[PDB]
Every structure is written in C-alpha cells, then in structure tokens.
Structure 1
Amino acid sequence: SVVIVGKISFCPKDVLGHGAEGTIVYRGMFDNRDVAVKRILPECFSFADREVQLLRESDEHPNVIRYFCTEKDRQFQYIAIELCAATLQEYVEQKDFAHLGLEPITLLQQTTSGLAHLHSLNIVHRDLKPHNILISMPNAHGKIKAMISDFGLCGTEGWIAPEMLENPTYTVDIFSAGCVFYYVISEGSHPFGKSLQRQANILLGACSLDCLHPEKHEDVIARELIEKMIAMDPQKRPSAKHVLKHPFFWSLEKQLQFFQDVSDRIEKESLDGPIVKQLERGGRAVVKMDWRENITVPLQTDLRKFRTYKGGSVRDLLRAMRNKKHHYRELPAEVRETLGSLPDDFVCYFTSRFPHLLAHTYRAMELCSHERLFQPYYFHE
C-alpha cells in the first residue's frame, strides 16, 4: 500500500515510530529521497507550524534531524524528515556501533550541541530520551553522528523532570539529558533505577550513580556533571552551553593546559585570598594529605631538592606540574620516563594518582570564570 499526498508519499503499513501528541512516522519518499514522514494531527498543527518556521529561519545544525518539506490536506499535515539508521537505545544495548567510529563522549557532545541549538530558538523538546536520539545514516565516508528528533524508532518511562507531573523551560530537557548521559556511560543503567521504579524515585529524588567509581578520575568528572543536570532544583541545572564547557568533554591536552593556566593564574595570589583559600579548601583529601608520597620515586627524588613545595597544598601540586611541564625537555632521563609522552601520559600520571584534582580545581576556579584566560574552560555571557 502507498499514500500519495503530494511531492511527499509514504507507506501506511510501515510505521517507523510514534512520539509526542499522537504523531506517527511512516517510511516514505520525497524528491526521490528515502525519508521518514510524520503525520501531524489537528491538535498539533499550531505546535508544528511554529517549530517548522523557527527551524526554517535559522541555519541547519548537523545534530538536529533535517527537515525537508511539508504537505497539507484538510485533516492532517505531512512532514518529511531525515531517515535514520537506529536509535541511541540500540546503540547502547546492541554494542554494534563500537567499530563505527562514533565514541560515547562525542555522541553526547553532539546530543548536547543539538539540544543547545533548539534552546537558542526557544524550542523545548520535553520528550528527550534515548529513543528520541537517532544515529544517522552513514556518510559518504561511513561517518555517523547523533541527532535530536521528536520521534523514536521501533523502557520509555522515567525521563521526565520532577517539576512537570504550560511553558516549560530548557531546564526540563537538561534533566532528561542528565539521565541520558548516565545511560550511555553506564551502558544501559538509569540514575533513578529500573524502568518501572524510575518515575516514583524521581519525585522523592532517589538516584544512584554507583556505576561511576569514586576514585577513578574519568568517573569523578562525569559524576560532577551528571548530578548537577539531574538536580531536583531546576535552577541548579546548567544550560546546554554550560554542559558543553564541562571537563567531561576535554581532551587530555586540554586538561593539562587547564592546570597550567590555573597555575600561572594563582602564582601571585595572596594565599589568604578567596581564590587560593577556595582552592585550598578541598585541601588534604584531594592531595591525599601529602602529594609527595603519592608520586613515584624518580619524581620524588627530583623535587626533594626544591625548596618549599608544601605537600598539603593543591596550589603547590599544580605548581610542581606546571614546572615539570615547562622544563620537561631539560629534565633528567629517569624523570621523563616516569612522565613521558607529554601531554597525554604526563597528565594521566597525576590524574590517575589524584582523581579529584581536576574536579576540585574546576569548581574552585569558577571565580575566574569571567576572566578572559578561562573562557575556553567556562561559559560566560
């Protein structure tokens, strides 16, 4: 069977997905392209028109599903949208995409970038979940990407923010995004528990991130971001543009450059001042109360001669890293062997032995978020 309403045509017997206000998506064709075709019901006409026009009036974002064309009969609208290979649910559960080059963290960056593009248009998803996040068809070179969509393809409960249960703000989607982040990193777990118990745990705020290790650097960074996004108070949730600046997305090189930019910034500070007082507030726990005992012998031997370098100061640890990074070429051979392969192995050396160093430093240095030097690491204005 086939239905021809216009340049658009589709197959009623083939249903690709159902989201959001009685909308149903069928396989179809437009302009000799294979597309998915959404059927808009009269209740959704006003919502559709406003969003189509708003999307049409700005540039195309690679991480928002593409809009082709629309046709209208009396009883419905028909919108042709980009056809996709799979959902994020399949990507996480199936594991098939492991070798296709799209990594989990970069997938979340794309998902967040597309969500930020919608929020900049005053569009709120309100449905966001793994079923709604689609994996694109392969590129000419086989590259695939993640895309925001209102409909999923063929455990849907528990993705909704507590406050809704009407003009919601972006903060609703950030809560959903927070659950999606954990779902990808944990490979199928949800912060609020199993599918049937999620929505009740969301109202009383019972969440478990325990798939993230407390002493593992990578997991500590992710935990700090996720718990802010799924926070009960909507005002404590960061905007999508704030999320994109979190160290969760930084390359190893960018992490080491942050420590350097911080070290050069607090070099002249009063040490009674709020900056260093804030950074030293975490204190001994971050450095394990002596950071000279948590580093390997060749490094210990080299900086034992150096005066000062208080073992309980976070600033001094960052000062040592800054100095060994600067003199790296001129250091003794046995010292370069312990660090080596700069920046990657150099920064992993310290982050592996001090898993809270970057997270603690990032929260403490927010006081400089407005300053020009930290604009790569924070979002301001």
Structure 2
Amino acid sequence: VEDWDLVQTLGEGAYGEVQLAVNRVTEEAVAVKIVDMKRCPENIKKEICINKMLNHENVVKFYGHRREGNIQYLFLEYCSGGELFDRIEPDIGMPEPDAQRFFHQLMAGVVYLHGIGITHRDIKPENLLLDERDNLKISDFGLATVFRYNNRERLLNKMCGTLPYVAPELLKRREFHAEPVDVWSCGIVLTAMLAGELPWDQPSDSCQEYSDWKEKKTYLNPWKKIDSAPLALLHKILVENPSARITIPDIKKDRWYNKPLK
C-alpha cells in the first residue's frame, strides 16, 4: 500500500515536476512534487513545514514526505479537476454564478491561512485547483511564509509572486502588510474569471491601463464586461492604498458576495 507508480507529468515547474502517482494495490491516486536539492535546501524545507500545519477543505492536502537522498517527495492531494486557469475562457471568462462559488471557496481558504498566520504570496488561477466535485483548493506553498507568530505580525520586505497579480505597495514600499497583498491578488483572480483577461502587466504608474483604472475609466476593457455589482467590489479591492483597501470580513458583507445566483 506504500509503493507507487509515476503515471504522468502534471506540472513541470522550476523546482521540478508534479507527477500523478497511482498505488499498485489500492489504486489510490496522489500528486507527488519532485524537488531536487542539488539541481535549494532552504525554500523547500519551508514548503514542507507550512504544509504540515495546513488542514482545510479549500487547501490542497499534504500527506507526507520521503527523502530518498536528494530527491525530495511531496505527497499531496490530487485534484482531477485541474487548474482554474483552464476554466477561464479568454476574453469572456466564465458564468457569473461559477465565479461567485469559486470566489467564496477562495475567500474561505484565505481566511484560514490568514488565521493560521501564513500568507501564500502567489495566488493566481494556475495555483488554484478543482477536485472531482469541482471544489476549489489552494495549491503551491513554495512562496508561502509566516507573517504572524506568537500573535505578533511581522511586515514583509521580500518581493515575490507574479507581476499581473502583485499589489502596487509590493513594488513601491520597502516593507508592507501581508494580508492586503493576498486580498489584492484574489481581486485580480476575480477580474480574470469575469472578463477572461488581466487588467495590466503590473500595477505601476508607468502602466497605462493601471492609470486608467485609478482614473475610474471603467468604460474600457476589463471593466465594461463585468457588471455593476461585482465591479463595485472590485472598486473596493483594487485600491492603491493598502490601508484603505477592503479587508476579508468586509468582503463577506459585500452586496455581490451575498447575492443569490448559483
């Protein structure tokens, strides 16, 4: 019951590759991430550490790890649904009720992380997975880190993530709060699900489409495909001042978030 077969590649990233593994006797399917420390022994130990803490229905499950010399194995829940990236149709997105359900489950997963004192740092559709029942789970904690410990919040100074998803403070400030950055990225993921495109390459004032958003020109692409209710929330998430920006408990009170659709 503990010997597996590497059936197929699933995601060939930088650190290595996620492979599908089927057990020979039970037929049990698991996802194994293969990280070679020779071809980083630091940011791999943090991923394992963080994973062992995590237990939640919107987070991809961690089963254990084997060491086999330098080949590190990450035994993780497999999601047969794939990446949410592949459910976004380019230039159109997806039906609004689907977007709302995936956004609820994303919020739930993120409240949980923010609750355990951890921040993901790289929320995007490629890091969001659907299982068999089409429920969304947050995957890839390779950039994740602790921002509260012993009930003391620590500010971040490392720049990381993916540029079209990254919050503007992360470019501007030397130090910043973790949670607002996560919130911002979820709001980009929403734009993605509802329009089928990203609003900008980065939120820098040297980016036209971002300047157009601060100027409230919601008469252009991205925003004119959205719809006034979900757009009203995006107005509260994609705020340049991290302190003014809506928090999660307040996203849960939002008109579109509580509108029946699905």
Both structures adopt the same fold (TM-score exceeding 0.5): yes
Contact 1:129 1:159 in 2 (8 A): yes
Contact 1:212 1:220 in 2 (8 A): no
Percent of aligned pairs with the same residue? 26
Q: Give the match for residue 8 of structure 2.
A: 14
Aligned residue runs from structure 1 range 50-199, under 5 A: 50-55=49-54, 60-84=55-79, 85-93=81-89, 103-138=98-133, 144-150=134-140, 157-165=163-171, 169-186=178-195, 188-192=196-200, 198-199=201-202
TM-score by length of 1: 0.50
Distance change >3 Å, CA 97–CA 65, structure 1 → 2: farther
Query: Residue type matched to 1:162 in 2?
Result: P
Shift of residue 238 of structure 1? 2.6
Query: Residue type matched to 2:87 in 1?
Result: Y
| 1:148-207 CA-partner distances (Å, limit 9, x unpaired) | 1118xxxx7511222334886121111111111111112x12222xxxxx12xx111435
Q: CA–CA distance in 2 between the matches of 1:168 and 1:33?
A: 41
Contact 1:110 1:145 in 2 (8 A): yes
Distance change >3 Å, CA 184–CA 43, structure 1 → 2: same
Query: Residue type matched to 2:61 in 1?
Result: R
Q: CA–CA distance in 1 between the matches of 2:33 and 2:177?
A: 24
Contact 2:93 2:193 in 1 (8 A): no
Aligned residue runs from structure 1 range 296-315, under 5 A: none
Distance change >3 Å, CA 160–CA 9, structure 1 → 2: farther
Q: CA–CA distance in 2 between the matches of 1:120 and 1:207?
A: 35
Query: Residue type matched to 1:79 in 2?
Result: L
Whichever structure has more strand as a proportion of its residues is: 2
Q: Give the match for residue 253 of structure 2.
A: 245
Query: Residue type matched to 1:45 in 2?
Result: I
Query: Residue type matched to 1:163 in 2?
Result: E
Q: CA–CA distance in 2 between the matches of 1:236 and 1:87?
A: 32
Q: CA–CA distance in 1 between the matches of 2:50 and 2:137?
A: 17
Unmatched 5+ stretches in structure 1: 1-5, 139-143, 193-197, 254-381
Distance change >3 Å, CA 36–CA 174, structure 1 → 2: same
Number of aligned residues: 220
Contact 1:8 1:28 in 2 (8 A): no
Shift of residue 121 of structure 1? 1.1
Q: CA–CA distance in 2 between the matches of 1:22 and 1:91?
A: 25
Q: CA–CA distance in 1 between the matches of 2:72 and 2:255?
A: 43
Contact 2:99 2:190 in 1 (8 A): no
Contact 1:129 1:177 in 2 (8 A): yes
Whichever structure has more helix as a proportion of its residues is: 1
Unmatched 5+ stretches in structure 2: 142-161
SS at match of 1:74: coil
Distance change >3 Å, CA 77–CA 240, structure 1 → 2: farther
Query: Residue type matched to 1:66 in 2?
Result: K
CA RMSD of aligned residues (A): 3.3
Q: CA–CA distance in 1 between the matches of 2:65 and 2:110?
A: 23
Contact 1:63 1:114 in 2 (8 A): yes
Distance change >3 Å, CA 48–CA 109, structure 1 → 2: same
Contact 1:10 1:28 in 2 (8 A): yes
Query: Residue type matched to 1:15 in 2?
Result: T
Mark the structure with the bigger radius of gyration: 1
Q: CA–CA distance in 1 between the matches of 2:176 and 2:62?
A: 24
| 1:205-247 CA-partner distances (Å, limit 9, x unpaired) | 4354544459xxx822222211222222222223333322211
